[PDB]
């Protein structure tokens, strides 16, 4: 029966597990030192950190939390100083507006550009 | 605006192609040729008094 087959499987697994523990004991290899001890310890540390974080977020709120995020970086600075090129560009742009009839001197935008 | 303006279509055609002078200079696009062939075979309409194309529908256009 399937019950008998499962019992045989369990007996074989039990024998293999006992041999596994004997070999680990002989080797002084701990099958749960890196496991499950270190894991529950790091989980406790994360719980402590989350307690401090919950304190901060409950004391300040969500908007303040996502708003105090730093955003400055010197690598994102954008410097604009090429007035020398933009002057000629704008002069030519207004010149062709004049010769194509898009501009007349009466308009105060012309005086501003000048 | 309404198709009743087409009961005197010569003058309306003249005004239409005075407004669209480029229409009388540009050949009919393939899109509009397909549209024309579909209008020539629209159901519920009197079959057109001409043959526009020689295709699998040539018998249809010739005999209906």
């Amino acid at each position: 029966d399937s019950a008998a087959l499962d019992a045989l499987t369990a007996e074989n697994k039990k024998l293999a597990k006992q041999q596994l523990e004997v070999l680990a004991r002989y080797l002084q290899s701990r099958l749960k030192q890196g496991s499950l001890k270190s894991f529950i310890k790091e989980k406790e540390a994360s719980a402590v950190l989350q307690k401090e974080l919950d304190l901060w977020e409950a004391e300040h709120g969500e908007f303040y939390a996502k708003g105090i995020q730093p955003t400055f970086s010197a690598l994102k600075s954008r410097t604009y100083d090429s007035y020398w090129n933009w002057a000629r560009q704008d002069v030519l742009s207004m010149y062709f507006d004049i010769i194509f009839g898009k501009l007349t001197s009466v308009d105060r935008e012309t005086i501003n550009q000048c | 605006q309404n198709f009743n303006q087409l009961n005197e279509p010569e003058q309306f055609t003249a005004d239409f192609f005075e407004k669209f002078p480029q229409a009388g200079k540009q050949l009919i696009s393939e899109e509009d040729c397909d549209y024309f062939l579909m209008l020539a075979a629209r159901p519920g309409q009197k079959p057109v008094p001409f043959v526009p194309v020689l295709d699998e529908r040539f018998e249809f256009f010739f005999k209906k």
Binding site: - | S29, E30, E31, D34
Partner: protein, 48 residues
């Protein structure tokens, strides 16, 4: 317009304008010009 509507912009040419018999005679005549025949531009021995 036809090519855009029918995806027939590129028409691969299956055969050269000259037959295998008229290939080299056309190669060797600088005045050999293609002529129209059945709407296809082909080389004919009349022009070689």
């Amino acid at each position: 317009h036809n090519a855009i509507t029918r995806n027939t912009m590129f028409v691969a040419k299956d055969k050269a304008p000259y037959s295998d018999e008229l290939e080299q005679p056309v190669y060797l005549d600088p005045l050999a010009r293609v002529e129209e025949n059945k709407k296809k531009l082909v080389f004919s021995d009349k022009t070689i």
